[PDB]
RNA sequence: GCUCAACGGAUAAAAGGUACUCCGGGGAUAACAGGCUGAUACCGCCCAAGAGUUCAUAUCGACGGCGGUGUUUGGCACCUC
């Protein structure tokens, strides 16, 4: 409705993902290897006019 | 006269590979899976300094605490060689 300027906003970018320390063990492979997926990129805050 | 030190000392005198392998056995001993547990992982809850212009609890919520699930990373090796 009315016109009010001088707005303030707090925005935080998404924190980046966390990898996991995991090892691969299969039916016949006791020593498979370090098998841990990487994390995901954090969220990004944008501006639109 | 022995660092015969692997110290009740198998010879005075001896290192490795096998995915080309083979035999006898073991779940006495691994891995997958089941089972037990729940540190860790996930979820929820407790208090609330603070941010939220005046207002902790609209939404977040720092230092910590308490549980659930069996659900990732874990530990044991009870069943199956």
Curated annotation (Swiss-Prot):
Record note on disruption phenotype: Essential for growth, it cannot be disrupted.
Induction: Constitutively expressed, levels decrease toward stationary phase (at protein level). Induced in a dose-dependent manner by UV irradiation.
Subcellular location: Cytoplasm
Domain notes: The C-terminus (residues 341-390) is not required for either 50S ribosome subunit association nor 70S ribosome dissociation.
Summary of the function given for this chain in its UniProt record: An essential GTPase which binds GTP, GDP and possibly (p)ppGpp with moderate affinity, with high nucleotide exchange rates and a fairly low GTP hydrolysis rate. Plays a role in control of the cell cycle, stress response, ribosome biogenesis and in those bacteria that undergo differentiation, in morphogenesis control.
Subunit structure: Monomer. Binds to the intersubunit face of the 50S ribosomal subunit where translation factors bind, protruding into the peptidyl-transfer center, leading to significant changes in both ObgE and 50S ribosome structure. Associates with SpoT. Binding to 50S ribosomes does not require SpoT. 50S ribosomal subunit binding is enhanced by guanosine nucleotides. In the pre-50S ribosomal subunit interacts with assembly factors RluD and RsfS.
Family the UniProt entry places it in: Belongs to the TRAFAC class OBG-HflX-like GTPase superfamily. OBG GTPase family.
Protein name, UniProt field: GTPase ObgE/CgtA
Organism this protein belongs to: Escherichia coli (strain K12)
Gene that produces this protein: obgE
């Amino acid at each position: 409705m009315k016109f009010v300027d001088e707005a303030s906003i707090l925005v935080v970018a998404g924190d980046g993902g966390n990898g996991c320390v995991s090892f691969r063990r299969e039916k016949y492979i006791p020593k498979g290897g370090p098998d841990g997926g990487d994390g995901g990129d954090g969220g990004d805050v944008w501006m639109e006019a």
